[PDB]
């Protein structure tokens, strides 16, 4: 009853493939994109989908645009399989997989130099499908699966075959949904990523903490800090490399103990930046003469 | 020169029927052959639109996505005189995963049959009908061969249960397992969303080397 | 049938040196059908025919 | 793969009343080759054994 839309959301970028990359008739399927609302991680429809149980597309017309010149040529056929379990991948003939496409109602073929659309065929009854990740049966959570089949070798302007896998366009969705039963859906549909890696500073005074201010990060978002160092001869001089990193705001202690009797490379710092995309932490070394660099990785959730 | 072949956005629902099809024959059995209560099940026929290979309705079922039996009455025809006697009970259970084959009581399997709605009890030398009971809600079911779950693709299962020993004209027990008649369906369907349904494609290949 | 009558030429008037897929074919049809029959070769069935 | 071949084995005979095959290219105006397209009505006339 929570009807939202109509809006626009970018599904994926479609990558047309060369003639040598096509071997079996199953290899003509460029994209096999499930059109569940919880299947486009990072977009606006998927972020909303994790806050209701059920949904139903009232109008899901998928709008393809080219990203390619008009001087190269190839031909696509594109449809939405309403059954999420009818799999065209086990068809051993190359023409039968594209007759499988145009036979589905609501299908469309086009040159890939122009912008065409494929609408989603509504059911005859009133069935809602579930959001979230696909647990056991696909027929509960997927309303359709978008396919794009390459039917033509990718030629160029110069009369030659393209030898490289070429990104050839983009897929956008013009969507209009219902929803029901507001909730949270326990599996998070986000993905984490090592944002950047930057080394610890080299303090001058042994056993005195000088504060390292790092910049360049996004404002007012929470980060995670784990140490990582590569090819450092800590025994090139006397002393033991003992580091202790604490935030002045967050929580956690990164400890680097390169004593070869008891080794402790452990700990993690949870800290969030200020309004200016900066944060600071107390870096201290027991033996300041040991100038071997040690880094850390900034973990962040991107979507 | 740009050209396209976009099919329209329409969903044609093709109401086929009424036509009549053959399901199976039915083998009545002797008292010597009945050991477990699950031996009293004579036929177990799924009533999907894609479940009768040979009929035209199963051929045509894999050229649409979904179906729904609007009217489905199965009409038992005997092929036996009035001189042998055994009592059947015929019903169409609507849940395709309720199975009576794991019941340890012989009287409970025949109270399982007469208590289903739409069941019809008869001596097997007499032609009787059994109507399918449709759902209250409007549910369609997927065509084609069965996937992971029968509850997406089967609307019912026809059963015939034997409740009495197969007796002769002289009141004595028949000592052989005896085929006794046929089953014909009188159907009426919808079909929505035409699709070639990729398991329908005839193709010989090697799947997997184990 | 589709017959090729001319060498495959490019923009520069030179010969193309590769075999090049070029388009598709769509039919626009209208049929009759008489005498409905299940047509016994249509039945999907796996069996062994003949041991040679 | 088409539905017409699926539905064809549920009747005995057919006859094409209207059948027009519509070639669609997928190529720009920068390469050039000349085709000729026809529908021979005899299914046993084969041009594949012509030496000219």
């Amino acid at each position: 009853i929570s009807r939202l839309g109509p809006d626009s959301d970018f599904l994926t970028s479609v990558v047309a493939k060369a003639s040598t990359s096509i071997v079996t008739p199953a290899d003509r399927i460029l994209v096999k994109q499930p059109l569940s609302a919880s299947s486009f991680p990072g977009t606006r429809i998927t972020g909303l989908s994790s806050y209701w149980e059920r949904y139903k597309w009232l109008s899901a017309v998928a709008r393809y645009v080219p990203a390619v010149p008009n001087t190269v040529a190839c031909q696509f056929v594109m449809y939405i399989d309403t059954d999420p379990l009818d799999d065209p991948s086990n068809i051993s003939d190359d023409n039968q997989i594209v007759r499988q496409a145009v036979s589905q109602a609501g299908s469309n073929q086009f040159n890939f130099n122009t912008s065409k659309t494929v609408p989603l065929i509504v059911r005859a009854d009133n069935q809602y499908y579930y959001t979230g990740v696909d647990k056991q049966n696909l027929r509960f959570s997927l309303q359709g699966i978008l396919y794009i089949i390459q039917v033509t070798d990718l030629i160029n302007f110069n009369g030659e075959l393209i030898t490289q896998d070429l990104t050839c366009g983009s897929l956008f969705l013009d969507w209009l949904v219902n929803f029901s039963i507001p909730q949270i859906n326990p599996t998070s549909l986000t993905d984490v990523r090592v944002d950047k890696a930057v080394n610890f500073i080299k303090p001058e005074v042994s056993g005195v903490a000088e504060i390292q201010t790092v910049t360049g990060l996004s404002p007012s978002t929470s980060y995670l800090l784990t140490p990582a160092f590569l090819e450092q001869n800590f025994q090139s001089e006397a002393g033991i490399y003992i580091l202790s990193a604490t935030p002045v705001e967050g929580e956690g202690t990164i400890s680097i103990n390169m004593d070869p009797t008891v080794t402790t490379v452990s700990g993690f710092i949870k800290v969030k930046t200020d309004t200016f995309g900066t944060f600071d932490l107390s870096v201290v070394l027991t033996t300041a003469s040991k100038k071997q660099t040690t880094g850390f990785n900034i973990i962040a959730a991107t979507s | 020169a740009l050209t396209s072949y976009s099919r329209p956005n329409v969903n044609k629902i093709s109401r086929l029927g009424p036509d009549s099809d053959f399901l199976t024959s039915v083998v009545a059995k002797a008292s010597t052959s009945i050991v477990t209560p699950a031996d009293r099940i004579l036929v177990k026929q799924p009533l999907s639109a894609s479940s009768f290979p040979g009929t035209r309705i199963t051929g045509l079922s894999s050229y649409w996505e979904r179906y729904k039996w609007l009217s489905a009455v199965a009409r038992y025809v005997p092929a036996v005189p009035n001189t042998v006697a055994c009592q059947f009970v015929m019903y169409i259970d609507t849940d395709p995963l309720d199975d009576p084959s794991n019941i340890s009581d012989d009287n409970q399997i025949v109270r399982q049959a007469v208590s289903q709605a739409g069941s019809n009890q008869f001596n097997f030398n007499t032609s009787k009908t059994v109507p399918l009971i449709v759902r209250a809600d409007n549910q369609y079911y997927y065509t084609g061969v069965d996937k992971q779950n029968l509850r997406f693709s089967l609307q019912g299962i026809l059963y015939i249960i034997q409740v009495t020993d197969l007796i002769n004209f002289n009141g004595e027990l028949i000592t052989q397992d005896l085929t006794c008649g046929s089953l014909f369906l009188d159907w009426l369907v919808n079909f929505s969303i035409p699709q070639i349904n990729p398991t329908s494609l005839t193709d010989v290949r090697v799947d997997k080397a184990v | 049938y589709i017959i090729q009558v001319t060498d495959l030429i490019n923009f520069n008037g030179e010969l193309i040196t590769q075999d090049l897929t070029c388009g598709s074919l769509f039919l626009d049809w209208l049929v009759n059908f008489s005498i409905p029959q299940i047509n016994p070769t249509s039945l999907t069935d796996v069996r062994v025919d003949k041991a040679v | 793969g088409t539905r017409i071949t699926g539905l064809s084995s549920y009747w005995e005979r057919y006859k094409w009343l209207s059948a027009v095959a519509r070639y669609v290219p997928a190529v720009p105006n920068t390469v050039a080759c000349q085709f000729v397209m026809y529908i021979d009505t005899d299914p046993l006339d084969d041009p594949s054994n012509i030496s000219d």
């Binding site: 130099n113 | 020169a1 740009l2 050209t3 976009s6 329209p8 035409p194 | 626009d28 | -």
Partner: peptide
């Protein structure tokens, strides 16, 4: 007898034409 039923188990596919200029 013979009867000619207009079978209604098909679907259309209408063809549209276009074409891009050089600029």
């Amino acid at each position: 007898r013979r009867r000619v039923v207009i079978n209604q188990s098909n679907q259309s596919m209408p063809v549209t034409s276009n074409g891009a200029p050089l600029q």
